[PDB]
Design a protein around this ligand. Structure first.
Ligand SMILES: FC(F)(F)Cc1cc2c(N3CCN(c4nnc(C(F)(F)F)s4)CC3)ncnc2s1
Length: 465
């Protein structure tokens, strides 16, 4: 720690922590190790153990400096840079793998990896525990500590790894993904980009600079005390740090951070700031502008907001837009998190929304989504993208467990509404062969459930006897 990094201590409040972030973000190289330790320290005493808490856990310089010393001693002790000559001011694959091994070999032999509050370097030092993306972050913090300015965090919507080397063009796995998959640490991500999985976003993943890595640790704050309770202090801190980053420009290329800020603003709006909808739309604009509109979550964030607000029309449109992105992916081994999300939207969330909409229609609601043929078209476009996703995939998506919910959802719209959508080869065009073959079935007053099921699962036969 340099003299200038120390002058704000002790940190006595949320605003003092924000001041420290502002100061670091004004430097050439914000100090990831310092910032992650401070966040982990304040999170430990606001969410993990609040015994004795009277306002805010004061972070004394002595305490934080000792944690920082533990981390830098561990890294500098274990990684001898003389063994890994740096040409071009760039790092080698062997050096990146060594740092990843140092972090990985340090971790407790046995612990649940999905635990809360194991994301920061405070957890690494005090508990020898990190979650999956926490290991990638720690590798980047260790590399910055070692002077390796070219090593940066790479992020998809469900995984993390690093970029490094000449022009920052090399990739390396540094952590695990999911449960029960084989370690691939040290390898590139080329095979996953080549196979067009969601996990590697067809190459349209985030390549962070240092300020984006600060944004990542701020998104990683976890205000959860337990299932029913959040720390208001940590929510306020995370929200203020995100606004600080937004104002500086460091969320411009970070759609998920914008969605996370929008969500926070929905919970507790900051006077004089953009509405949550404005922020969700900024996250989609970021995904279009910087990532070829190949991210799924910007539309999921927007749809979730509309769903909570029971804006059925806008929620369906945003889920249809979500499906329009996924249709150009192949469903691969390790994409299960986004399959679970689509399955929940199709098979639980939409059915519950339309069920309430049907009750409200019975009670004489006007302008109901269930009487709007554009909403029926959004529902059909959502299924169309899911069917098209499945085409050419190494792993199928649909099965009969989806068919009953599709028949129920279609049936929530009366035949006179459904008839008004023109399906062309309100107007809708299908991309998937499954939906094209279903077109015939979509306007009958009583939908043919068995034929729908046959078409959705492309199952060959009916029952023998
Ligand atoms: F690094 C990994 F491996 F953990 C991948 C990352 C995830 C993630 C994130 N998330 C994940 C998505 N997430 C969502 N919460 N709601 C979502 C939506 F379904 F409503 F869209 S998506 C929480 C924040 N937020 C900022 N940055 C990142 S980087």
């Amino acid at each position: 720690l340099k003299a200038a990094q120390k002058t704000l201590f002790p940190l006595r409040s949320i605003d003092d922590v924000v001041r420290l972030f502002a100061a670091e973000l004004g430097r050439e190289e914000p100090d990831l190790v310092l910032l992650s330790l401070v966040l982990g320290f304040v999170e430990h005493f606001l969410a993990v153990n609040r015994v004795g808490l009277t306002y805010f856990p004061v972070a004394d310089l002595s305490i934080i400096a000792a944690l920082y010393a533990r981390f830098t001693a561990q890294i500098r002790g274990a990684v001898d840079l003389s063994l890994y000559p740096r040409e071009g001011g760039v790092s080698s694959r062997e050096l990146v793998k060594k740092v990843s091994d140092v972090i990985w070999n340090s971790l407790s032999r046995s612990y649940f990896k999905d635990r809360a509050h194991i994301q920061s370097l405070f957890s690494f030092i005090t508990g020898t525990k990190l979650d999956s993306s926490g290991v990638a972050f720690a590798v980047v913090g260790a590399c910055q500590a070692l002077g390796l300015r070219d090593v940066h965090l790479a992020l998809s919507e469900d995984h993390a790894w690093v970029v490094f080397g000449p022009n920052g063009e090399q990739t390396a796995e540094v952590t695990w993904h999911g449960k029960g998959n084989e370690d691939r640490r040290g390898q590139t991500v080329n095979a996953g980009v080549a196979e067009r999985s969601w996990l590697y976003l067809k190459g349209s993943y985030m390549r962070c600079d240092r300020k984006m890595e600060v944004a990542f640790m701020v998104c990683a704050i976890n205000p959860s005390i337990d299932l029913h309770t959040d720390s208001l202090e940590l929510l306020q801190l995370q929200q203020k740090l995100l606004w600080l980053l937004y104002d500086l420009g460091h969320l411009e290329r970070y759609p998920m951070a914008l969605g996370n800020l929008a969500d926070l603003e929905e919970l507790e709006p900051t006077p004089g700031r953009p509405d949550p909808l404005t922020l969700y739309h900024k996250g989609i604009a970021s995904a279009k502008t910087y990532y070829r509109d190949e991210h799924i979550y910007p539309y999921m964030y927007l749809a979730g907001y509309h769903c909570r607000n029971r804006n059925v029309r806008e929620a369906l449109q945003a889920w249809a837009d979500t499906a329009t992105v996924i249709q150009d992916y192949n469903y691969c081994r390790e994409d299960e998190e986004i399959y679970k999300e689509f399955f929940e939207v199709a098979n639980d969330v939409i059915p519950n929304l339309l069920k309430e909409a049907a009750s409200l229609l019975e009670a004489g609601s006007q302008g109901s989504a269930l009487q709007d043929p554009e909403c029926f078209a959004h529902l059909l476009r959502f299924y169309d993208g899911i069917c098209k996703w499945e085409e050419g995939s190494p792993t199928p998506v649909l099965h009969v467990g989806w068919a009953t919910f599709l028949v129920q959802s279609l049936g929530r719209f009366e035949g006179q509404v459904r008839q008004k959508v023109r399906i062309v080869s309100p107007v809708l065009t299908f991309q998937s062969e499954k939906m094209k073959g279903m077109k015939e079935l979509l306007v009958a007053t009583k939908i043919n459930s068995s034929a729908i099921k046959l078409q959705l699962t492309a199952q060959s036969q009916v029952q023998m006897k």
